[PDB]
Design a protein around this nucleic acid. Structure first.
Ligand SMILES: C/C=C\C=C\[C@@H]1O[C@](O)([C@H](CC)C(=O)NC/C=C/C=C(\C)[C@@H](OC)[C@@H](C)[C@@H]2O[C@H](/C=C/C=C/C=C(\C)C(=O)c3c(O)cc[nH]c3=O)[C@H](O)[C@@H]2O)[C@H](O)[C@H](O)C1(C)C
Ligand SMILES: Nc1nc2c(ncn2[C@@H]2O[C@H](COP(=O)(O)OP(=O)(O)O)[C@@H](O)[C@H]2O)c(=O)[nH]1
Ligand SMILES: [Mg+2]
Ligand SMILES: [Zn+2]
Lengths: 377, 144, 60, 208
RNA sequence: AGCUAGUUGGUGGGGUAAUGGCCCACCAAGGCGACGACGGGUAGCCGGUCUGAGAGGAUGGCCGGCCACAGGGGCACUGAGACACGGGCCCCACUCCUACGGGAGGCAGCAGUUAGGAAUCUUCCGCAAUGGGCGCAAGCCUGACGGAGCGACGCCGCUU
RNA sequence: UAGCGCCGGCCAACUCCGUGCCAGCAGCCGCGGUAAUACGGAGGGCGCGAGCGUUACCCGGAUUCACUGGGCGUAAAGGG
RNA sequence: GGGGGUGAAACGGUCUCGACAGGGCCUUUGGACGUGGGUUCGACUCCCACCACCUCCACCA
């Protein structure tokens, strides 16, 4: 099956506390949306969606960040029976750190425990919470419903069309809240090309494939790239297939979450944290200085000052490597607040460019935020 | 919980007059390796550059666990000695050809790597047999 | 044998064996090829590099 | 490929004057004059009694360096030389000379072979009508070495070819200095190429 | 260091295109072995190839010739020819479809994957040529083949 | 575009500093113990050149299985 | 990508006795128990996030 692009394409995930509905919901959207048109996907008349389904734990956060770094908007799933909880709160914060645009909301479990206030109380405290993080709390859409009941009835009749069931409809009140509100954004299909790698797997009788969201530019069956980073020396290759959701794409425009087939590589050469830059642009390095704003007790987490030794973890695109902070000479220490410029040396070499926004996370709480000044390695 | 280390090889080698016990500046990644006892004193005399003593040439295996963190085995590790004790050893060292040698290594009550130094006979001239015909003829040839 | 000055080989690292005894150390008959797998080239090295893993240091 | 670097450097060292540059390497500064000794921090100190190898080396190095031809080309040529019928200490020289770039030099055009080299590679020189940009093209008995039309009115083919007004050409060569033609009469012999080299030792260097 | 009973031979058969213990009855006790049989290990053989003053030694990758095999193993059918690489029957192993009763398959063709390893390539272009098969012919098929691709793997030429 | 090997002897190519049988080299002999042409860098030189070195394997050298072309009193080798 | 495992004694109480270094002859704080940081008046001990190994799962655009 050859993938044929028609409607604009957007990337959107679904985050929230555990057991609130995320997984079910996704199942929900999927069937509900598919009833109309003959990590998941769904076309909704106006648009075409790729739904990443954040499944992990406070142990699996090394994917939460990645998952969110993409998606031009996120569905915050909150249980009606329970209401905002720590993971419901934690994601929001990240959706904020990772810098996600617009956050739709879906109170789920409305089919259970009925209470006049409960729904309004909760709908009010969710907004409250968002507002506590600089998100359009009041302005943001909050759909009430039951993922299960929609999904359930969609199994009963996988043909159920909108208007034929109150539960299925609520899903549309969401798909709709997503069709409008969450805006499709700027792509940048006119720059070089580059794509971080999120997952590398071997397709039998074909070879290695690398997936991720095309950062900038495009890629076509027959072009040439250079897997850069995390490897002793960059590898130059040629692509032999651009696929999207098991469908044959002809040209991978930016913003596309796609799988790229790398001719000749062995699954050990590729990883998660490299990039498929087009030759010439980008090059591995391990040293640089940069402007880094350091969040205070108030946010992120650092509540004391850090010296030069510090070996925080630096998150670039899809991965994160530990690095050493070579404070400039004549500074001596940084403290919560202020934007300091300092030199750092990553133990592992990673693709870098002039202005690359990266973050600093240590001890489980984001301690800093910054852009790359100059490359020295 | 580390066994008493020892320089059996030079305890006999040089005559021992006075002794001195001092703590060292261990890297810890090293303190591990010392507790495992994997370290020898072969070819290691202790001196002091400037006014501080530094046990030099002491080999402390790397810590497998420690990965990239460990420092090189032969390092100019620094020792800790009372100021009046340090000057007495300098008086003897600068003035005459007496060495300071690692006599052994262990951990005291408190549990710190504590090295035991010794007073050295020194001397021990290393006989070097010489002049190989080959060279001799060789030079004659060229010079003239 | 592990050539050069300094190494990064652990009690379980992946190495590539070359072949060359060491008239000095008894039953030692193979040199470890520096610069392959876990065996790292020689830091700071600048002379006979080809035979010590280390790549050409840019004259910075 | 072909050395490319301090040549009036090999002039000395070898100690027996070289002229890969032509004019300068001909004037009162062939580098030799002022520095008849070999290069380096040393260069002028008791030069230890050379060894039987050092000699064979220096001889072949001498001769070779006297063309630019890199070892592979040189040596590869010597081999074939050996094979062929007749003495080799001559035939090896017979071929070292049929080398177009050399012939083109032996016959003016360039105040040196290095300058005879850049002269072929750039299509300037020709052979029997059609051009040849192959320094390695071994010249046969008869094939004249005429210049080009875009090459003549050149500020440099002038000067060079104006050093012909008077001076004679190799005993196995002719020279219509007007149409810049001239042929290749016959295969040169040991004397005609009274070179500062003892071909024998070069036959031996290539044994051990 | 001894080996052998279809073993060696004989008469008559069976079989094949044809000789023959190739197979079978029957008769005889034979056959081979230090000039190395039997057994073990290794191995496809040659033209050549590398080396060597040579006589020798080492090798058999590419290209040509012969042999053997086609997942392991047995068998025949068809046919001028096969006991048949992309034909068939059967057992075995393994993977795949199933409505669980039986189906489909074999890359040591080309290209490609994975495993193993120090290490070995494009899911390509064309039947224009040469060669083949079928056909009166036009023509069809030909991953033979003619080419392009990737790798300093090698040789020769070339540049800075 | 210019790289790579080597510079104690065999083997073509030498000096300063660093280290002080340590760190290290290494094909053989062997270097390293406080002026190291042998270790590390630099300067310089040599060889070679889009290549240069290493490793493995074959022949050579090896008349060291000798037919060409060896030996056996004491070197291995005369059978009690 | 995750889970688990190993980073000294089934162990909350000083300080390398000491020299270097910043305040207050003697007190003292730092440094050294893989690295980076937290929490304590105070950690080798206790949380965290890294590192290197080990081990068990996951993984076909
Ligand atoms: C942070 C993880 C990964 C980041 C990855 C990279 O980040 C980026 O580098 C990014 C570039 C700016 C980056 O540097 N991110 C890195 C940083 C980004 C920081 C931005 C935006 C800030 O503004 C200064 C923003 C969060 C800010 O905080 C405020 C709120 C703070 C709340 C703190 C916690 C509170 C109360 C709390 O109760 C709380 C809790 O949540 C957990 C535990 N216990 C708690 O008690 C407010 O909501 C503001 O909005 C790029 O986006 C890259 O492309 C990237 C996405 C790959
Ligand atoms: N009562 C009720 N339960 C639901 C509804 N949707 C999902 N659930 C239940 O919520 C539990 C967790 O759902 P899940 O999708 O795994 O949430 P996740 O933790 O975000 O993945 C499951 O047992 C679902 O059956 C709903 O609409 N109503
Ligand atoms: Mg889930
Ligand atoms: Zn000159």
């Amino acid at each position: 099956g050859e993938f044929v692009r028609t409607k604009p394409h957007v990337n959107v995930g679904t985050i929230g506390h555990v057991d609130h509905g995320k997984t079910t919901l996704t199942a929900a959207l999927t069937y509900v949306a598919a009833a109309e048109n003959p990590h998941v996907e769904y076309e909704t008349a106006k648009r075409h969606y790729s739904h990443v389904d954040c499944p992990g734990h406070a142990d699996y956060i090394k994917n939460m960040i990645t998952g969110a770094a993409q998606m031009d908007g996120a569905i915050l799933v909150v249980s009606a029976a329970d209401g905002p909880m720590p993971q419901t709160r934690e994601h929001i914060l990240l959706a904020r750190q990772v810098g996600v645009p617009y956050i739709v909301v879906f109170m789920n479990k409305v089919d259970m425990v009925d209470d006049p206030e409960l729904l309004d109380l909760v709908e009010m405290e969710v907004r409250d919470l968002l507002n506590q993080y600089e998100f359009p709390g009041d302005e943001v859409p909050v759909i009430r419903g039951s993922a299960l009941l929609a999904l359930e009835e969609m199994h009963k009749n996988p043909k159920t069309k909108r208007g034929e069931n109150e539960w299925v409809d609520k899903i549309w009140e969401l798909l709709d809240a997503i069709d409008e509100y969450i805006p499709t954004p700027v792509r940048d299909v006119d720059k070089p090309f580059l794509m971080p790698v999120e997952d590398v797997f071997t397709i039998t009788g074909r070879g290695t494939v690398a997936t991720g969201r095309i950062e900038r530019g495009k890629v076509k069956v027959g072009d040439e790239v250079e897997i850069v980073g995390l490897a002793p020396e960059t590898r130059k290759t040629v692509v032999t297939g651009v696929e999207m959701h098991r469908k044959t794409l002809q040209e991978g425009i930016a913003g596309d979450n796609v799988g790229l087939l790398l001719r000749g590589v062995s699954r050990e050469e590729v990883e998660r944290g490299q990039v498929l830059a087009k030759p010439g642009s980008i090059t591995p390095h391990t040293k640089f200085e940069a402007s880094v704003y350091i969040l205070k007790k108030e946010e992120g987490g650092r509540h004391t000052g850090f010296f030069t030794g510090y070996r925080p973890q630096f998150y670039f695109r899809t991965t994160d490597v530990t690095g050493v902070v070579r404070l400039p000479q004549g500074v001596e220490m940084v403290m919560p607040g202020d934007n300091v410029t300092f030199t750092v040396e990553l133990i592992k070499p990673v693709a870098l460019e002039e202005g690359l926004r990266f973050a600093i996370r240590e001890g489980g709480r984001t301690v800093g935020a910054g852009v790359v000044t100059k490359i020295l390695e | 919980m580390a066994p008493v280390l020892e320089n059996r090889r030079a305890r006999h080698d040089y005559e021992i007059l006075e002794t001195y016990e001092a703590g060292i500046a261990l890297k810890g990644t090293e303190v591990k390796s010392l507790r495992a006892g994997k370290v020898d004193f072969t070819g290691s005399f202790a001196r002091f550059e400037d006014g501080e003593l530094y046990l030099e040439n002491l080999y402390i295996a790397p810590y497998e666990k420690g990965s990239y963190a460990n420092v090189d085995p032969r390092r100019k590790r620094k020792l800790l000695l009372h100021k009046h004790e340090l000057r007495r050893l300098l008086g003897k060292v600068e003035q005459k050809g007496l060495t300071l040698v690692p006599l052994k290594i262990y951990f005291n009550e408190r549990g710190y790597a504590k090295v035991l130094l010794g007073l050295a006979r020194g001397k021990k001239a290393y006989e070097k047999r010489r002049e190989d015909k080959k060279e001799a003829v060789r030079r004659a040839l060229e010079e003239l | 044998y592990i050539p050069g000055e300094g190494h990064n080989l652990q009690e379980h690292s992946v190495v590539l064996i070359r072949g060359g005894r060491v008239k000095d150390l008894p039953g030692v008959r193979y040199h470890i090829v520096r610069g392959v797998y876990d065996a790292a080239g020689v830091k700071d090295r600048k002379k006979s590099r080809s035979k010590y893993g280390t790549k050409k240091p840019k004259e910075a | 490929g072909r050395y490319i670097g301090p040549v009036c450097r090999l002039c000395r060292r070898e100690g027996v004057k070289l002229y890969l540059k032509g004019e300068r390497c001909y004037s009162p500064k062939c580098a030799m004059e002022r520095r008849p000794y070999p290069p380096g921090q040393h260069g002028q100190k008791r030069a230890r009694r050379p060894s039987d190898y050092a000699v064979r080396l220096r001889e072949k190095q001498k001769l070779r360096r006297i063309y630019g031809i890199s070892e592979r080309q040189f040596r590869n040529l010597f081999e074939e030389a050996s094979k062929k019928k007749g003495v080799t200490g001559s035939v090896f020289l017979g071929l070292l000379e049929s080398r177009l770039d050399n012939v083109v030099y032996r016959l003016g055009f360039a105040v040196s072979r290095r300058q005879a080299r850049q002269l072929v590679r750039h299509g300037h020189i020709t052979v029997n009508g059609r051009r040849v940009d192959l320094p390695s093209y071994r010249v046969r008995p008869g094939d004249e070495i005429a210049v080009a039309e875009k090459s003549r009115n050149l500020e440099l083919i002038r000067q060079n070819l104006e050093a012909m007004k008077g001076r004679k050409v190799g005993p196995w060569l002719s020279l219509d200095v007007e149409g810049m033609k001239g042929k290749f009469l016959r295969l040169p012999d040991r004397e005609d190429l009274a070179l500062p080299v003892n071909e024998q030792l070069v036959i031996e260097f290539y044994s051990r």
